[PDB]
Structures are given as structure tokens and as C-alpha cells.
Chains A and B, each alone.
Chain A
Amino acid sequence: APSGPFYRVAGMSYLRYSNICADLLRNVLKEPFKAKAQARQAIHFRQAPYVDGKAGASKVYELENGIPKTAN
């Protein structure tokens, strides 16, 4: 449906593609460096939309591996 590069036409944003490439470069690094490159890879946060002003459901991220390779 969109018109762009191979990540953009698939619905993916650019930041997810570039972080997927960063994650796959990180997974093949040297062992004096791969463990400390796991520090810059963890995604731990949460979010919650707010529709009416204070109500909204929660969405929690616990990801130590990196960005989700699966669809957003």
C-alpha cells in the first residue's frame, strides 16, 4: 500500500528496520563486547493511551532481547 523502500511498503517504520539491523549486528559481536552490547539493547518501559482524560488500558514492554522482529 505505501510507496517507498522495502521496509516502508511493508508497513514498517524506518526506526524499526534500522534497529532490527542494529540488533542483528549486535547478536554476532565479540564475546568481550556482545555482553556489554546487551545493555544498549534492552527495552523496558510501559505505555497507556488516555482517551477521555484519565481512563485507558495498559501496554507493558519487558524486552531484554531487543526490538520485536514480529509485526508491530
Chain B
Amino acid sequence: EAAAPAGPKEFTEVWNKKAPSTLIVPEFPSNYTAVKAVGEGQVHGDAFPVNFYTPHSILSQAQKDTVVLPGVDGYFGVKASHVPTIAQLKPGVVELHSGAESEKFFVSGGFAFVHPNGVTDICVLEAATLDQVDPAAVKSALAAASAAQPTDEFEQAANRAAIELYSALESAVEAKA
């Protein structure tokens, strides 16, 4: 069922037969990662590596002790040696804690994985700190988003995503600590 066991090493060996021999092996995305999933370790007690990423940033890469992730069933939390997870996130607040101090990033959604070696990779598109959103434009936009309700299920699905993201943004901005 897995009769083509590829990899960098197999492609190196087969690629020395069909390409001309003077060409060095093309690099692979594996060659710039020292961290894997099945490579056990990287745990060290209470704090775990939280690779909070973004297409246009890297928001965090140091080790944290508890992460609140806004999955599509609801908000869940990750402690150190958590179960492996591939969690799709709804638009909500990813809370990074190192102790008493909490930094609250409101994200746009996008997946968040927990691997067997305890590394967690939050992977969202637009991941803003909740400081830089205004509380005025959200209901100002949701009043229009509750109006244009067409039969076009493309536009209606965009309206559903609009009212759900805007409602989660509102419910996260009135409920500050």
C-alpha cells in the first residue's frame, strides 16, 4: 500500500541515474528542519515549544506552558505532553501563557497541530494581537453583513463566515480581562 517509500535519500539515489551526474541533488524542505514529529523529546516538564506561525510573520517560537486554541468544536487547551491533534481553528483568541502573563492573539482561523513529540504548530493566516482591532467597526460591518443575504451560496457562505468571524471578534472584544 506504501510501495513507493520516497524521501530525500531515495530521491538522491534514483536521481543519480536519470539526471546528468554533475548536477548536485536538489534540496528538500526536510533539510532546513531540525524538529520532526516522531523524534521523541523536546518536552522537559511543563513548557512546550509553541511554533505560532503566519505566512507573513513568526509570532512565537519559544517554549510555553499552556496554549488556549480556538478549535471548531470550541476553545481547548494544550499542556505539555498533550495527545496528538490536528485541530482546525475557528476565528478566536489564541492565548499564549508563560505564567501569570498572557498575550492574546486573535487569529483568522487555520489549523493547529500537536505532534507526538509535544511540539505545537499554530498555523493561521491573519494573526493579529487583539490590541490592534477597534471595537467600533465590527458591529458597524456586521450590520451590513446581516443585510446582504442572497441566494448565492458562494456569497451566502462568505456572509456566514463574515457574521461568524465578526460575532467572534465582538464576543472576544467585550469580554476582555
Q: Do chains A and B touch in the complex (CB under 8 A)?
A: yes
Tell which of B131, B133, B153, B161 touches A20, judged by Cβ atoms closer than 8 Å: B161
Q: Which of A10, A18, A27 contacts B109 (CB 8 A)?
A: A18
Bound: A3/B162 CA distance, A: 22
Binary flags per residue of A45-71, CB closer than 8 Å to B gives 1, else 0: 000000000000000000000000111
Q: Using Cβ atoms and an 8 Å threshold, which residues of chain B touch A20?
A: 158, 161-162
Partner of A71, one of B138, B152, B166: B152
CB pair A28–B134 under 8 Å, yes or no, is yes
List chain B residues, Cβ under 8 A from A70.
154-155
A12 touches B157 (CB 8 A): yes
Type the 1/0 row for B65-86, where 1 means its CB is closer than 8 Å to any CB of A. Answer: 0000000000000000000000
Interface of B is mostly: helix
A51→B137 CA distance, assembly (Å) = 46
Contacts of B161 in A (CB 8 A): 6-7, 17, 20-21, 24
Question: Could you give, for residues 18-43 of chain A, a 1 whenever the CB lies within 8 Å of some chain B CB and a 0 otherwise?
Answer: 11111111111110110001001000
Instruction: List B contacts of A23 (CB < 8 A).
Output: 126
Apart from A24-B161, A24-B165, 16 more pairs, CB < 8 Å: A6-B157, A9-B153, A12-B157, A17-B161, A18-B108, A21-B125, A22-B108, A24-B141, A24-B166, A25-B133, A28-B169, A29-B134, A30-B131, A69-B158, A70-B155, A71-B152
A residues adjacent to B (C-beta < 8 A): 6-7, 9-12, 17-30, 32-33, 37, 40, 69-72
